[model samples]
Target: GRGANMPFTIMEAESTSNATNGTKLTPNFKPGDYAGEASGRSSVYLDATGEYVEFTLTSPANAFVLRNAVAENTTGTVSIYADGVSKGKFNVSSKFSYLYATPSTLGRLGYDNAPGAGLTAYWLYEDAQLMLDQVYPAGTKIKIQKDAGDVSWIYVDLLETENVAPPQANPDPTKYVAVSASKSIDQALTEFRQDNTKKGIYIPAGEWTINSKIFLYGRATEIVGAGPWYTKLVAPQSQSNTDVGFNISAAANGSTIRDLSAWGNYINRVDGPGKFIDGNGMQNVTVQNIWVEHFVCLYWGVNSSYNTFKNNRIKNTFADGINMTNGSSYNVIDNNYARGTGADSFALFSATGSYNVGNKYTNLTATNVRRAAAFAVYGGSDNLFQNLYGADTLTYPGITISSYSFGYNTLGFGDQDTVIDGATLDRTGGDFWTSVGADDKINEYQNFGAIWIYGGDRAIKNILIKNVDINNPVYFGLMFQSMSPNNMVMQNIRVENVNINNPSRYGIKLVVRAEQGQGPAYGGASFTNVKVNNPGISAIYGEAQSPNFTVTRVSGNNW
Candidate 1:
């Protein structure tokens, strides 16, 4: 019910004769003809005015995306309409090339012939007030049309929609006992567990002060609340480290918690969700549409897997927001907003020798965070952190990957095959002085880079970062540092299509400390098409101790 990918219902072209809906094309055009190999194998080409396509929705949707190609010298416009009402128009310009050039001319020739090279996609919403506000009910009609009299041809490849369910009425109180404010929620829950007839406990629309932790354990057990704005769970005082606002243990597998607001007393440094102490942690748990704030940590998963945390707001945590440590894998954390975190908003930390793998953290927005980093991977393998957007107001780096405590067994070791893509980091309005303590320590954090890849105890390999935008960082935009005594190497690191704006120091910093007659070496690492603007130092600064680093098409101020 959360996410479904719906392909375009119809692909068509406009006819010369006046038609209500243009004739649908068969297989459209060949894929490479429009934008090269990136366009897949088939697409529809439209060059004339009044050409249009009609899309029918099988389910209600709030947002839609259209991927099309634009070539150098191409010019046109397309308009969208939902159920006959004009939503908006977008431009198609040929000023950019969508494909890569041939290698013979040093990649300068036939640059326009590359496919998917310069094409861009647009995410359009039905309502102008909110990006996701305009929802089209099921069976709604949508239309896209080329502007009249426009001569520039446009290639349309794909269209997708995000289906979201509308709000529904609250469940009947007779089915589940309504939690009363007059009694302790823990007591009510304890009594409810004895009968075991009811599978859920509901909290109505009111503030309920909870002093003790509420533990929910049982197969398919659930705790439901009215909408987050209506049902408030208040923990006014802080407790010891062992205390938690909600403790969901391994026995609570297949449980669902939704639509509640939990507030903790930061002065007491209490945590939102207590760590699962059981040998085998919870599985198939869903936490959705909730707001958690002012806690030591929002959600802590130890040895847990296959859990879903989505569409939640977690803020003002004294430490991290969500942490999956000690072999916690195969979890999905998406579309969540985390702000005012003292450390990384989302972290993948493997303290116990068990692997942390195959977890996905996407579409997360973090802000006003301090220290270690915003989105971090201290130790983990095959984990993905993507489509992340954040601004560090009190942090030295926006993102971090390191092997600082390799010998401790808790430090991230054997971190490989990880990907970080489509991230935007900004340091505007950040307190650089407060984070660094003094200017001299700025270099200690790799010149306060927006991204840091550090190898101190073990080798790190095959990490890829692409399509990122870093703006106004206090120091470099990207950095790689190694000081491993074991001669641990950082290899096969790839960075592509990164745009750095107004960096206070170098655009890229590569540092390797030489010690104990051995120095960390880098191999097969490349920076491609990296552009920088208004750099204070140079485009790239590589220490003499660093080796085997190559850069291509790196251009900007001070290069």
Candidate 2:
């Protein structure tokens, strides 16, 4: 059971910025001791009158004053005085805690309105009158009558009254290791790991370049950003010899890469084919919310296993997203948007005795996929794909799964296998536009097509496709062709409730035949309750190669 303990009070915010940066303010504040006089685009200017740090608020809420003590001279206490009346105070002339603001917008609202919303404000001072040792809870309304002398930073913390808790001590200083962008990432990682296992490295907002392969040696580490939009990482061309930007190799488990982007590198395809984020024989590694763009490669993942790639935007890659080859298992690829991939968008190719099992892919979108074959799950078994979307191709099938190139003995399209399960293919979602469905498919040149499955010596067994949608495909919506003598038995191959609007060619096309020494005479295939809205030709077509075929149920003007 995936479980998390509660009463796990998360700090809504904790900001630390230099006031020398010119009265830098925190996110969204109002009211007494505030840095801003008026809300809605007012300057966070320094208070020259030496009275109170007065900024008018377009709105009103409870307020908390904070001061950041970076240097000993910069150290000072922060006092909350609203409308010229001293209300609450915290003594922090020396110590700096993860600051939490009170009187937050959320704090004013009822609990049902905005749950778990809090604010943090940063302050700087050089006096002790306002310095207090602890942060105030939310819902503490301190009324300020006028601008008074001796007031600094002010922020409002928005939290439910019941949700308010006294600020806890920041984690031990040894828990988090500071990492700077000015130093080598590889070296910084090495030193941080040497210091703590469960540690975090801070990379400020800037483009960082790596010239070598970085290995996370089985440590739980986080690379966090001040902001995702502001943080950028550049990989060196020489380092890109391996297409992987940040790799957690075999010995590296429980590692995480977050809040950064790796860009501007020339990637050379590995001799045996590989993935951008290879997790071959690795487990418990996570790559989250990162972007991989403008890099080229041949094939991804000759062998990778048990890792997660989520919320990533991968563009301009030469090959597939996750090529689970040679025994990759239990990996999850979800919430990923891929565009301009050169070959099949995602593949499971050439897996031998390697049980590439129990993997999941969901919410994937691809565009301008250059390969004649846009997507293929070749040679692996028991993998699942859900919620896939793609358009714009170059004379290829949209998706395919075959034992064609990878051998049956080595990879053995195995028994008790399931492929293409419960997946939906649509045109509109996420950062993609719905108008891309109108594109054409040209052979040897370029054309946008949907899906095809062909050329396997072994039976493709126990497969199901449900709730699929394809539009204006040049080739076919669903195609399975086995041209061999061995009579591949595609058992329990059911396509139910498929909504295909406009196909350039046919829908539900099946051509199964026995090649020499493959399938002796004929094979068995079945389609259960597969319905099409309006298809070009033969909503269901089965050739002689497939001798025993069954369309158990069909309705609603389908041919």
Candidate 3:
């Protein structure tokens, strides 16, 4: 046989009414009997029968429950309130008498058995953590008990591994503590990074607006907001000159930011180069489940690599949505949606001597883009682009390979040559869609071609465009030009099943025109199954007299 730990004590209060009444009760008096008004009338108040305690919850359970104990021959009603809102109430008998409240209130009130008698009678105020353990022991389901009052709600620090249970009237800092409104988030950050043992900081369910960017060091941290509805990070219009809503500097690594949003940011230009998250030189950072819009620059990973940007929606940027520069590698950019940018929607730029390599861009939808550039992958090598869907947009050159004269000072060329599969390009006025010899100013050799090789006084070689669908309104499909000797081996460029609405020019135009001291070059390109649908013009056009030239299986819909 087993025995209980401690003897159960009968908790009680003097009266069951307000303090104005003559009834005197302990501070823990939640419910009691009244003698002033109705005989059967009962009242309750949130009282501390023991000690004055304060706590900030650092666990999942942030609520509490209040219960009224039934006397020997007492049958009355009990009511409980927290911060002016009715939390719970119950009828009292020898068997049942209790009320429930959350830790969200600064103080709770309970009524037991009177009006003239102040709230004195009581039973038990259970900790939310204990209640949850009883109801949901498996710990699989995400159960939200109830809403917190305006008083205070405990937010568990996500860094600690051990689960901290809610405390009783006495709040011990070792297990439970409360957060004072006087403490600022800045102070929180200082405390968060003090010991340097925590992995991340949790911003509980509340609206948190900040004027400055929360910069993190090399420590791996997670800034979790309240849900998408209640949590938001806002910046002032005056402090728009800064960088990023949450800027992670060079030393910050292995960081994650999720379940939050940013609005009303300066989408025009900040002090330095504009970027939403300026990953100056951090690595292993992830940004997921976030909605970002109304900004000038969305994300910029400068000299940073091995990062992942997934499951995010970015719209309405003054320039590009995502921009990469310097030497970055092995970055996985998948399952992302980007719409409406003044410049190229998605750009992979490697300026100076750095490189962007082994990067994957898959399942991306880019629409309504202005300027003469769209989907630019430049100054990088071995970058794979799969399942890219683009439409209803225009660009100077649909896809450009321009090399900068800094850093590496060389173009991106590799063994596979940036394999692009399931890629579709829509629209007519793109640079690579212009008609041949129509207007050198706009619709010339370097205009309508699918691949434009425009860089420093050199030709682009060893590049492949495979499995591409080009449905143009009016212009050429693909173009290759070499000021010197541009050598590009086109393999498996399927123009088959291409639905061309209207066009007054050729489909696949490969022109090798030399200037100044140079003339006709020795190298040309080959087209395989390059099909098009246009009535008035030639389907395939090749210029620049050269001995090396071949067109295999080049058919058309209207042949």
Best by TM-score: 1
Instruction: Please report the TM-score between candidate 1 and the true structure.
Output: 0.63
Looking at model 2, report the run of 10 residues with the lowest lDDT sum: 1-10
lDDT of 1 by residue, 75-112 (tens): 55667677878776655443222223222221121113
Model 2 segments more than 4 A misplaced = 1-176, 226-228, 237-244, 267-275, 296-303, 372-374, 405-412, 417-449, 512-522, 537-557
Clashing pairs in 1: 31-41, 35-115, 36-115, 98-117, 98-118, 99-114, 99-117
- TM-score of every prediction relative to native: 0.63, 0.59, 0.58
Model 1 spans > 4 angstroms off? 1-169, 237-242, 268-280, 410-416, 428-446, 512-521, 543-545, 548-559
Candidates in descending TM-score order: 1, 2, 3
Tens-digit per-residue lDDT, 1-559, candidate 2: 0111112121111222111123444522122223221111122333333323332322333323222222222333344544445665444332211122333221221112112345432121111112123333433333221133323433321111112133222143365444564566677677777775547566666667654456666466666644333466666544434444556666566777776656634332223433445444666778776666534532254456667877776655544555666777677877766544545666666556465677777666654453434456665567777766665443356566665644444544555455554343432111111222222222222122365555456556656566666655554676665545544555655566666655545566554321223322234445555555556665655553345554445444365
- With candidate 1 superimposed using the best TM-score fit, by how many Å does residue 531's alpha carbon deviate from the native? 1.5
Q: What is the lDDT of residue 524 in candidate 3?
A: 44
